[PDB]
Structure formats: structure tokens, C-alpha cells
Amino acid sequence: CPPAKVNILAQSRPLSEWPINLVSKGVQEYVYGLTAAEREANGTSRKSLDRWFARTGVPTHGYTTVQGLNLILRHTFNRYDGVIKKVETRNEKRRSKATRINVSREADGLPPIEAEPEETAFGPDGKLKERPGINPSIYCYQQVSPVPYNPAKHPALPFSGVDPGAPLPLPGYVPEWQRPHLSTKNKRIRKWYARANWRRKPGRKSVLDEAKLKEAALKEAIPIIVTIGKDWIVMDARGLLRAVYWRGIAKPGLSLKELLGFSGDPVLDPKRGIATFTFKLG
DNA sequence: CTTCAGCAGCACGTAGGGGAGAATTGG
RNA sequence: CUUGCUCGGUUCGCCGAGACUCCCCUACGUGCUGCUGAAG
DNA sequence: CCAATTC
């Protein structure tokens, strides 16, 4: 299941202010640090995750979605136990080392020697020692998936979305002295607005018109709008188009129905202004 | 003006926890 | 092969050669900064 | 349709 990247183009308000991000971070800040006998009492239903949000003092910000709540609760409590799992596995290896030295101990016939003490992940106050930090990932789920852009349905915005089904489209003077060795083989076709062509390096003298490349990248945008609640993330499927193009899956035959068909559960990373997409099973 | 000594890191490997859906279905 | 990353050519118009299992977290290191205690 | 259920 190889990954792919999409650069977020448009959004209403920053990802970190989304109810999904807020509720995730709250759940993690509450769970993270809890005595081993507290996580038992506080450790898939509308009813279950409507008393869990009352027994625990984790407020919900207007986000009651089973597909949107269970995820956080599945990851958090698996991390809290992988932290204990690191200590437990190291202790298991320590006990294996004790067994290894004991084997030779019976062969020598001497009484067993003293063994080093073990460790835990909790200190004396009952709280966790290696407290895991807050993952900022805003995971997306089935009912809120990458949909193409249709200006009739989605909110007005300067963009231009192609029809669900149509084979997607397949300055730049290439001057005469540039044509004795133009690449006859198959490779990428960048464009005039590509930023690899305008980066500031000493052998270059026309560097980085600030808005021109950005505008000509946005003109030909393939937008996809994941909409969670009243918030929307308008994406750029070109990064997804490249991945299927260079990985030998579709050769100039796809639309914004088959492209997205190649997982509708993206992982959004708010800090980088990026989106991550998975593939199918093969 | 030197060895070492123990914490931290702008920086780097490691090193090991975790994560990366889609099929009914009711109302 | 439309975004995006790395590195090169230039007449400054884009051209060429590539990477593409990624994100978070805990800790620790080696070179350099910082606080100290030994020896003339 | 679309937010809830399985596994």
C-alpha cells in the first residue's frame, strides 16, 4: 500500500481548529498519563461513546461520529500500551539473558548469580514516565472521503473542477539552440510554471517570479473537496495523478472517478500543508 | 591547562512504540 | 507522465539527470555550545 | 441518503 502526497490548495480555516483535531488532542491529553488501574475503568457504539465522553472529562466540541471517534480511541490506547510494550519486551529480553546465563550456571554447578532489576513505565506517583506526545494527524474516514469538485454543490470559490468522467488532459518555447538533444525517452513533462525551473541557484538569472508559477499551477488544478462538518479541504489531485502515472497503473486513461478509485481514508498533517493518500491492495 | 564527569541539545545516524478500511443497513 | 522534492546546463525562453514507505512520539548519542570537580 | 453497524 504505497503512499502519495497532495498539496492542500484551499481551506476555510486552519486544520488545527477543526473539531476532529481538537477532540483528538483532548482525548490524547486526557488518556496520556493515567495510573494502570485508572485506564482499566476508563478503557463501537453511539451509546458507548456517549457515556465514555461523560465518565471521562473529555469534552466533545460538536463531534459525535462513530467512524470519527473510535479511531482516536483505538490509536490512543494502543500507543499507551505500546509504551508499556517497549518496557515489557526489554524486560522479556532481560529474562532471556537471565535464562542464558542460568543455562551455563547449571553446567558449572554453581548457585545462580544475582540478576539485575527490571523497569516499568510508571513512576512512584502513579502517572506514566514516558508520556507520549500528541499526534496531530487529522485522520479521515469513510463517510467523509475525497470527493471531486462540483461547483453546484460545494461552496463558491475560485477554482475549476472537471467532470467526474472524462479522460484528464495530457511559454515553453524550447528555443532552437535547445533542440539537439531533447529527451527522446519517456520521462516527466514539467511546465513553464514548474518551480524546479525557477529555483535560485548561481547559474540561473531569471529566478522565481513570486506569484506567476503559483497562479499557473492553480489555473490547471484538479480539485477534490473533503468536507468534514462545516469545514472543507480543497486538494490538488495532480500529485495523485503523477503517482498513478509513473507507477505503471494507468496510461492517459482515467477520470475523477477512477483516479480516486485507486483509499478514501487520507491522513492530513496540518503543519506541512499536506495530505497523504493510500492505494488499493496492489 | 589539562585530563575526565553528567545533563542539555541548533546537528546526525539508530532504535522501537504507534498509524496508514470498506461492507451492509435503517429510518 | 500537469502539482510538489534533489542535482546539474543556459543565449534566462526551459532543458537535462534522478528520489519517491511515509507521518508522529519517547529516549539516547557523536562532533560543537553550555555548567563543574581533579593535576603542575 | 447517510450516519450508524460488523470484522
Side-chain angles (χ1 to χ4, degrees), chain A residues 1-118 120-282:
Chain A
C1 295
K5 276 80 175 173
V6 171
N7 264 11
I8 294 143
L9 300 175
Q11 32 84 213
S12 65
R13 53 203 211 171
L15 283 84
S16 46
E17 192 274 332
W18 273 23
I20 166 75
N21 198 224
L22 285 184
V23 171
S24 175
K25 96 175 190 59
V27 168
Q28 304 194 26
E29 285 182 349
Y30 172 90
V31 176
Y32 282 138
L34 275 177
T35 315
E38 196 67 33
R39 72 165 191 176
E40 304 295 323
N42 296 253
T44 302
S45 166
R46 196 166 188 178
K47 274 302 187 306
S48 84
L49 300 174
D50 274 333
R51 60 154 184 250
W52 202 99
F53 269 56
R55 170 170 51 189
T56 62
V58 185
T60 183
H61 204 72
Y63 188 79
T64 301
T65 301
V66 191
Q67 314 214 51
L69 291 178
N70 198 21
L71 295 174
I72 319 165
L73 270 77
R74 215 270 306 188
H75 309 335
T76 309
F77 288 76
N78 218 353
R79 266 94 65 81
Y80 204 81
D81 211 337
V83 174
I84 309 192
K85 184 176 173 66
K86 198 177 303 179
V87 165
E88 288 190 354
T89 45
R90 279 168 47 241
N91 281 11
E92 185 183 0
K93 296 183 290 294
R94 189 163 294 166
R95 183 175 292 171
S96 176
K97 187 267 183 182
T99 307
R100 292 275 86 79
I101 61 171
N102 279 357
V103 167
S104 310
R105 276 287 160 192
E106 292 91 8
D108 296 348
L110 296 176
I113 209 66
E114 208 266 342
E116 285 86 14
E118 67 187 16
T120 64
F122 297 83
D125 203 19
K127 227 57 66 184
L128 198 68
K129 283 184 304 183
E130 292 87 355
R131 307 177 192 179
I134 317 297
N135 209 339
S137 300
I138 295 169
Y139 285 88
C140 292
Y141 42 98
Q142 185 191 7
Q143 75 180 359
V144 182
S145 301
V147 193
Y149 204 60
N150 306 328
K153 202 262 182 182
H154 308 290
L157 198 67
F159 263 104
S160 173
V162 285
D163 295 353
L168 282 167
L170 196 68
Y173 172 58
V174 65
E176 191 178 354
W177 62 271
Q178 273 193 1
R179 310 176 179 182
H181 286 87
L182 289 172
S183 286
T184 178
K185 286 299 299 178
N186 167 261
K187 249 295 184 181
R188 285 185 59 187
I189 180 66
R190 274 160 317 137
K191 269 287 300 175
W192 90 273
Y193 61 85
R195 298 191 51 245
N197 283 334
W198 293 66
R199 71 190 189 278
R200 174 68 240 180
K201 81 180 189 74
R204 189 163 305 180
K205 210 173 42 183
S206 45
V207 293
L208 203 46
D209 277 333
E210 267 67 35
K212 299 313 288 161
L213 289 76
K214 270 296 294 176
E215 188 185 23
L218 296 155
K219 184 61 182 301
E220 312 149 347
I222 310 184
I224 26 176
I225 168 179
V226 200
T227 307
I228 310 208
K230 298 293 178 68
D231 279 331
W232 39 269
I233 292 169
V234 169
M235 263 175 198
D236 197 19
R238 291 182 299 177
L240 287 172
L241 187 64
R242 205 203 93 223
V244 289
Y245 269 179
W246 81 270
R247 291 188 90 107
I249 294 169
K251 284 205 338 162
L254 53 91
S255 60
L256 277 299
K257 175 184 182 57
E258 295 176 354
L259 189 57
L260 293 175
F262 300 112
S263 305
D265 284 54
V267 185
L268 314 182
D269 196 1
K271 328 180 296 293
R272 301 187 192 274
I274 192 174
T276 306
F277 281 62
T278 308
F279 283 169
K280 301 287 103 173
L281 305 173

Short mmCIF file of all heavy atoms in Angstrom, two decimals, chain A residues 223-268, unseen atoms left out:
data_model
loop_
_atom_site.label_atom_id
_atom_site.label_comp_id
_atom_site.label_asym_id
_atom_site.label_seq_id
_atom_site.Cartn_x
_atom_site.Cartn_y
_atom_site.Cartn_z
N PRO A 223 -9.28 19.82 -8.49
CA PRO A 223 -9.64 19.88 -7.06
C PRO A 223 -10.50 18.76 -6.50
O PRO A 223 -11.38 18.24 -7.19
CB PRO A 223 -10.39 21.22 -6.95
CG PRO A 223 -10.72 21.64 -8.35
CD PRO A 223 -10.29 20.55 -9.29
N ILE A 224 -10.25 18.37 -5.25
CA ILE A 224 -11.07 17.36 -4.59
C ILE A 224 -11.44 17.89 -3.21
O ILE A 224 -10.59 18.46 -2.54
CB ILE A 224 -10.36 15.99 -4.50
CG1 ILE A 224 -8.84 16.17 -4.50
CG2 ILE A 224 -10.71 15.14 -5.71
CD1 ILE A 224 -8.08 14.88 -4.33
N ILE A 225 -12.68 17.78 -2.80
CA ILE A 225 -13.07 18.51 -1.60
C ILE A 225 -13.55 17.58 -0.50
O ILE A 225 -14.66 17.04 -0.56
CB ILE A 225 -14.06 19.63 -1.95
CG1 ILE A 225 -14.72 20.21 -0.70
CG2 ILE A 225 -15.06 19.12 -2.96
CD1 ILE A 225 -15.68 21.34 -0.99
N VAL A 226 -12.69 17.34 0.48
CA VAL A 226 -13.12 16.51 1.60
C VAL A 226 -13.84 17.46 2.55
O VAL A 226 -13.27 18.46 2.96
CB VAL A 226 -11.91 15.89 2.32
CG1 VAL A 226 -12.34 14.68 3.14
CG2 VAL A 226 -10.85 15.48 1.32
N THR A 227 -15.08 17.15 2.91
CA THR A 227 -15.85 18.08 3.74
C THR A 227 -16.29 17.48 5.08
O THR A 227 -17.21 16.66 5.12
CB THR A 227 -17.10 18.57 2.97
OG1 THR A 227 -16.70 19.11 1.71
CG2 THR A 227 -17.83 19.65 3.76
N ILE A 228 -15.64 17.89 6.16
CA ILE A 228 -16.00 17.37 7.48
C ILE A 228 -16.77 18.46 8.21
O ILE A 228 -16.20 19.49 8.56
CB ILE A 228 -14.76 17.02 8.34
CG1 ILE A 228 -13.78 16.14 7.57
CG2 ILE A 228 -15.18 16.33 9.63
CD1 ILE A 228 -12.96 15.23 8.45
N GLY A 229 -18.06 18.24 8.45
CA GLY A 229 -18.85 19.28 9.08
C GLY A 229 -19.00 20.48 8.19
O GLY A 229 -19.30 20.37 6.99
N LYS A 230 -18.81 21.66 8.77
CA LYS A 230 -18.89 22.91 8.04
C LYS A 230 -17.55 23.32 7.43
O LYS A 230 -17.45 24.41 6.86
CB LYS A 230 -19.39 24.03 8.96
CG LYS A 230 -20.78 23.80 9.52
CD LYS A 230 -21.83 23.84 8.41
CE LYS A 230 -23.22 23.55 8.96
NZ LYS A 230 -23.71 24.65 9.84
N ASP A 231 -16.54 22.46 7.53
CA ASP A 231 -15.21 22.75 7.02
C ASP A 231 -14.93 21.89 5.79
O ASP A 231 -15.43 20.77 5.67
CB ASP A 231 -14.15 22.49 8.09
CG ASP A 231 -14.03 23.63 9.07
OD1 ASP A 231 -14.30 24.78 8.66
OD2 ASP A 231 -13.68 23.39 10.24
N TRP A 232 -14.11 22.45 4.91
CA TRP A 232 -13.77 21.75 3.68
C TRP A 232 -12.30 21.88 3.34
O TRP A 232 -11.69 22.92 3.60
CB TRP A 232 -14.62 22.30 2.53
CG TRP A 232 -14.84 23.79 2.58
CD1 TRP A 232 -15.87 24.44 3.19
CD2 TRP A 232 -14.01 24.80 2.00
NE1 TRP A 232 -15.73 25.80 3.03
CE2 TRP A 232 -14.59 26.05 2.30
CE3 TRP A 232 -12.82 24.78 1.26
CZ2 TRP A 232 -14.04 27.25 1.89
CZ3 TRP A 232 -12.27 25.98 0.86
CH2 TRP A 232 -12.88 27.20 1.17
N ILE A 233 -11.72 20.83 2.78
CA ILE A 233 -10.33 20.82 2.36
C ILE A 233 -10.33 20.61 0.85
O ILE A 233 -10.67 19.52 0.38
CB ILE A 233 -9.52 19.73 3.07
CG1 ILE A 233 -9.37 20.06 4.56
CG2 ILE A 233 -8.15 19.56 2.42
CD1 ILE A 233 -8.82 18.92 5.39
N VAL A 234 -9.98 21.64 0.09
CA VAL A 234 -9.89 21.54 -1.36
C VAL A 234 -8.46 21.19 -1.71
O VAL A 234 -7.52 21.91 -1.33
CB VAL A 234 -10.33 22.84 -2.04
CG1 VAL A 234 -9.98 22.80 -3.52
CG2 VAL A 234 -11.82 23.06 -1.86
N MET A 235 -8.28 20.10 -2.42
CA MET A 235 -6.99 19.46 -2.59
C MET A 235 -6.54 19.64 -4.03
O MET A 235 -7.17 20.34 -4.83
CB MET A 235 -7.10 17.99 -2.21
CG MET A 235 -6.68 17.66 -0.80
SD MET A 235 -7.03 15.93 -0.48
CE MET A 235 -6.99 15.90 1.29
N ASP A 236 -5.43 18.99 -4.38
CA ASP A 236 -4.85 19.08 -5.72
C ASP A 236 -4.47 17.67 -6.15
O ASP A 236 -3.41 17.17 -5.76
CB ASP A 236 -3.66 20.02 -5.74
CG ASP A 236 -3.29 20.46 -7.13
OD1 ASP A 236 -4.14 20.35 -8.04
OD2 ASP A 236 -2.15 20.92 -7.33
N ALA A 237 -5.30 17.05 -6.97
CA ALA A 237 -5.11 15.65 -7.32
C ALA A 237 -3.93 15.42 -8.24
O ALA A 237 -3.64 14.26 -8.56
CB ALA A 237 -6.38 15.08 -7.95
N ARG A 238 -3.26 16.48 -8.69
CA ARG A 238 -2.12 16.34 -9.60
C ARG A 238 -1.04 15.47 -8.99
O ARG A 238 -0.41 14.68 -9.69
CB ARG A 238 -1.60 17.70 -10.03
CG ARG A 238 -2.57 18.42 -10.94
CD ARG A 238 -2.02 19.75 -11.41
NE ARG A 238 -1.76 20.64 -10.29
CZ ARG A 238 -1.22 21.84 -10.42
NH1 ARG A 238 -0.88 22.29 -11.62
NH2 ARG A 238 -1.01 22.59 -9.35
N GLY A 239 -0.79 15.63 -7.69
CA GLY A 239 0.14 14.74 -7.01
C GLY A 239 -0.30 13.30 -7.06
O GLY A 239 0.53 12.40 -7.19
N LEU A 240 -1.61 13.06 -6.96
CA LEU A 240 -2.15 11.72 -7.14
C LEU A 240 -2.07 11.27 -8.58
O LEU A 240 -1.88 10.08 -8.85
CB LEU A 240 -3.60 11.67 -6.67
CG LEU A 240 -3.81 11.72 -5.17
CD1 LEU A 240 -5.29 11.87 -4.85
CD2 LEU A 240 -3.25 10.44 -4.57
N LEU A 241 -2.24 12.20 -9.52
CA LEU A 241 -2.15 11.86 -10.93
C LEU A 241 -0.75 11.37 -11.27
O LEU A 241 -0.58 10.37 -11.98
CB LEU A 241 -2.55 13.07 -11.76
CG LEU A 241 -2.71 12.94 -13.26
CD1 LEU A 241 -3.86 11.99 -13.54
CD2 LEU A 241 -2.97 14.30 -13.90
N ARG A 242 0.27 12.05 -10.75
CA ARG A 242 1.64 11.67 -11.03
C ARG A 242 1.94 10.27 -10.50
O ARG A 242 2.63 9.49 -11.18
CB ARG A 242 2.60 12.69 -10.42
CG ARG A 242 3.95 12.77 -11.11
CD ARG A 242 5.02 13.33 -10.20
NE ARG A 242 5.74 12.28 -9.48
CZ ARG A 242 6.06 12.33 -8.20
NH1 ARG A 242 5.77 13.38 -7.45
NH2 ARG A 242 6.69 11.30 -7.64
N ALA A 243 1.45 9.95 -9.31
CA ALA A 243 1.78 8.67 -8.70
C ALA A 243 1.26 7.51 -9.53
O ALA A 243 1.98 6.53 -9.77
CB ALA A 243 1.22 8.61 -7.28
N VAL A 244 0.01 7.60 -10.00
CA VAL A 244 -0.51 6.54 -10.86
C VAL A 244 0.19 6.55 -12.21
O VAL A 244 0.35 5.50 -12.83
CB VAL A 244 -2.04 6.66 -11.00
CG1 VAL A 244 -2.71 6.28 -9.70
CG2 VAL A 244 -2.42 8.04 -11.40
N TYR A 245 0.63 7.72 -12.67
CA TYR A 245 1.27 7.82 -13.98
C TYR A 245 2.63 7.14 -14.03
O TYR A 245 2.93 6.41 -14.98
CB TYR A 245 1.42 9.28 -14.41
CG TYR A 245 0.26 9.81 -15.21
CD1 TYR A 245 0.24 11.13 -15.65
CD2 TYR A 245 -0.82 9.00 -15.53
CE1 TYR A 245 -0.82 11.62 -16.39
CE2 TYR A 245 -1.89 9.48 -16.26
CZ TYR A 245 -1.88 10.79 -16.69
OH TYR A 245 -2.94 11.28 -17.42
N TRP A 246 3.47 7.37 -13.02
CA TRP A 246 4.81 6.81 -13.05
C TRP A 246 4.91 5.43 -12.43
O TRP A 246 5.98 4.81 -12.52
CB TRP A 246 5.81 7.76 -12.36
CG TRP A 246 5.85 7.70 -10.87
CD1 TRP A 246 5.10 8.43 -10.00
CD2 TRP A 246 6.70 6.87 -10.06
NE1 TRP A 246 5.42 8.11 -8.71
CE2 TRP A 246 6.40 7.16 -8.72
CE3 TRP A 246 7.69 5.93 -10.34
CZ2 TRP A 246 7.05 6.53 -7.66
CZ3 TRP A 246 8.33 5.30 -9.29
CH2 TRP A 246 8.01 5.60 -7.97
N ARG A 247 3.84 4.90 -11.85
CA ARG A 247 3.88 3.59 -11.22
C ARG A 247 3.24 2.50 -12.09
O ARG A 247 2.93 1.42 -11.59
CB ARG A 247 3.23 3.63 -9.84
CG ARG A 247 4.03 4.42 -8.83
CD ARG A 247 3.46 4.28 -7.43
NE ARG A 247 4.05 3.15 -6.73
CZ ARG A 247 4.93 3.26 -5.75
NH1 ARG A 247 5.34 4.44 -5.32
NH2 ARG A 247 5.42 2.16 -5.19
N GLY A 248 3.03 2.78 -13.38
CA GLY A 248 2.58 1.77 -14.32
C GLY A 248 1.21 1.19 -14.05
O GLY A 248 1.02 -0.03 -14.10
N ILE A 249 0.24 2.05 -13.76
CA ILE A 249 -1.14 1.64 -13.49
C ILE A 249 -2.09 2.10 -14.59
O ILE A 249 -2.80 1.28 -15.19
CB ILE A 249 -1.60 2.14 -12.10
CG1 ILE A 249 -0.80 1.46 -11.00
CG2 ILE A 249 -3.08 1.89 -11.92
CD1 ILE A 249 -1.01 2.08 -9.63
N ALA A 250 -2.11 3.40 -14.88
CA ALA A 250 -2.97 3.94 -15.93
C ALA A 250 -2.15 4.86 -16.83
O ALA A 250 -1.42 5.72 -16.33
CB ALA A 250 -4.16 4.70 -15.34
N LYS A 251 -2.26 4.64 -18.14
CA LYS A 251 -1.52 5.44 -19.11
C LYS A 251 -2.43 6.36 -19.89
O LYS A 251 -2.90 6.00 -20.97
CB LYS A 251 -0.78 4.55 -20.10
CG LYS A 251 0.47 3.89 -19.56
CD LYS A 251 1.36 3.60 -20.75
CE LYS A 251 0.52 3.55 -22.02
NZ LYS A 251 1.34 3.70 -23.25
N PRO A 252 -2.69 7.53 -19.35
CA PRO A 252 -3.53 8.51 -20.00
C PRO A 252 -4.99 8.15 -20.10
O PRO A 252 -5.69 8.70 -20.95
N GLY A 253 -5.49 7.25 -19.25
CA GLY A 253 -6.89 6.83 -19.28
C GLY A 253 -7.43 6.76 -17.86
O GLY A 253 -7.23 5.77 -17.16
N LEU A 254 -8.08 7.84 -17.41
CA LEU A 254 -8.66 7.90 -16.06
C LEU A 254 -9.45 9.19 -15.93
O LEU A 254 -9.31 10.10 -16.74
CB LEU A 254 -7.59 7.80 -14.96
CG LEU A 254 -6.41 8.77 -14.99
CD1 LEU A 254 -6.74 9.99 -14.17
CD2 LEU A 254 -5.17 8.09 -14.41
N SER A 255 -10.28 9.29 -14.89
CA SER A 255 -11.10 10.48 -14.69
C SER A 255 -11.20 10.71 -13.20
O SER A 255 -10.69 9.91 -12.43
CB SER A 255 -12.48 10.23 -15.25
OG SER A 255 -13.09 9.12 -14.61
N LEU A 256 -11.85 11.79 -12.76
CA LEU A 256 -12.03 11.94 -11.32
C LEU A 256 -13.19 11.07 -10.83
O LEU A 256 -14.05 11.50 -10.06
CB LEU A 256 -12.25 13.40 -10.94
CG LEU A 256 -11.01 14.27 -10.77
CD1 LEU A 256 -10.14 13.73 -9.66
CD2 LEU A 256 -10.24 14.39 -12.07
N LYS A 257 -13.21 9.85 -11.29
CA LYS A 257 -13.97 8.74 -10.73
C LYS A 257 -13.10 7.51 -10.57
O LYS A 257 -13.23 6.79 -9.58
CB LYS A 257 -15.19 8.42 -11.61
CG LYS A 257 -15.97 7.20 -11.17
CD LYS A 257 -17.10 6.88 -12.15
CE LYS A 257 -17.92 5.69 -11.68
NZ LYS A 257 -18.49 5.91 -10.32
N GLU A 258 -12.21 7.25 -11.53
CA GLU A 258 -11.30 6.12 -11.45
C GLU A 258 -10.00 6.49 -10.76
O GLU A 258 -9.39 5.63 -10.12
CB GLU A 258 -11.00 5.58 -12.84
CG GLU A 258 -12.21 4.97 -13.54
CD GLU A 258 -11.90 4.52 -14.95
OE1 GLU A 258 -10.78 4.77 -15.43
OE2 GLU A 258 -12.79 3.91 -15.59
N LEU A 259 -9.59 7.76 -10.87
CA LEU A 259 -8.38 8.20 -10.18
C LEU A 259 -8.51 8.00 -8.68
O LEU A 259 -7.76 7.22 -8.07
CB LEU A 259 -8.11 9.67 -10.52
CG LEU A 259 -6.77 10.24 -10.06
CD1 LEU A 259 -5.64 9.41 -10.64
CD2 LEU A 259 -6.64 11.69 -10.48
N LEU A 260 -9.51 8.65 -8.08
CA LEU A 260 -9.75 8.49 -6.65
C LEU A 260 -10.05 7.04 -6.30
O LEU A 260 -9.88 6.64 -5.15
CB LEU A 260 -10.90 9.38 -6.21
CG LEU A 260 -10.58 10.87 -6.31
CD1 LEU A 260 -11.80 11.70 -5.97
CD2 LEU A 260 -9.42 11.20 -5.38
N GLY A 261 -10.49 6.25 -7.27
CA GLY A 261 -10.74 4.84 -7.02
C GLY A 261 -9.48 4.07 -6.68
O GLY A 261 -9.51 3.12 -5.89
N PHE A 262 -8.36 4.45 -7.29
CA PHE A 262 -7.08 3.84 -6.94
C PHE A 262 -6.67 4.12 -5.50
O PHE A 262 -5.89 3.34 -4.95
CB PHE A 262 -5.98 4.34 -7.88
CG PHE A 262 -6.22 4.03 -9.32
CD1 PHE A 262 -6.50 5.04 -10.22
CD2 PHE A 262 -6.19 2.73 -9.78
CE1 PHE A 262 -6.73 4.75 -11.54
CE2 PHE A 262 -6.41 2.44 -11.10
CZ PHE A 262 -6.68 3.45 -11.98
N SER A 263 -7.30 4.83 -1.39
CA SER A 263 -8.20 4.61 -0.26
C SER A 263 -8.77 5.93 0.21
O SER A 263 -8.05 6.93 0.34
CB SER A 263 -7.46 3.91 0.88
OG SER A 263 -6.85 2.72 0.43
N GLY A 264 -10.07 5.94 0.48
CA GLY A 264 -10.75 7.15 0.88
C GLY A 264 -10.60 7.49 2.35
O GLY A 264 -11.53 8.01 2.97
N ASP A 265 -9.45 7.11 2.92
CA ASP A 265 -9.15 7.41 4.33
C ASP A 265 -7.81 8.20 4.41
O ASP A 265 -6.82 7.66 4.91
CB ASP A 265 -9.08 6.14 5.17
CG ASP A 265 -10.45 5.56 5.48
OD1 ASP A 265 -11.24 5.33 4.54
OD2 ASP A 265 -10.75 5.33 6.67
N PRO A 266 -7.76 9.49 3.93
CA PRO A 266 -6.50 10.24 3.93
C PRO A 266 -6.03 10.59 5.33
O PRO A 266 -6.83 10.68 6.27
CB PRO A 266 -6.84 11.50 3.13
CG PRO A 266 -8.09 11.18 2.39
CD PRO A 266 -8.83 10.24 3.27
N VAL A 267 -4.72 10.78 5.46
CA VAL A 267 -4.10 11.25 6.70
C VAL A 267 -3.59 12.66 6.45
O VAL A 267 -2.64 12.85 5.67
CB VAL A 267 -2.97 10.31 7.15
CG1 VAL A 267 -2.42 10.75 8.49
CG2 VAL A 267 -3.46 8.88 7.21
N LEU A 268 -4.19 13.64 7.10
CA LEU A 268 -3.83 15.03 6.92
C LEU A 268 -2.85 15.46 8.00
O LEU A 268 -3.07 15.18 9.19
CB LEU A 268 -5.07 15.93 6.95
CG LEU A 268 -6.29 15.49 6.15
CD1 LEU A 268 -7.40 16.52 6.25
CD2 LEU A 268 -5.92 15.24 4.70
#
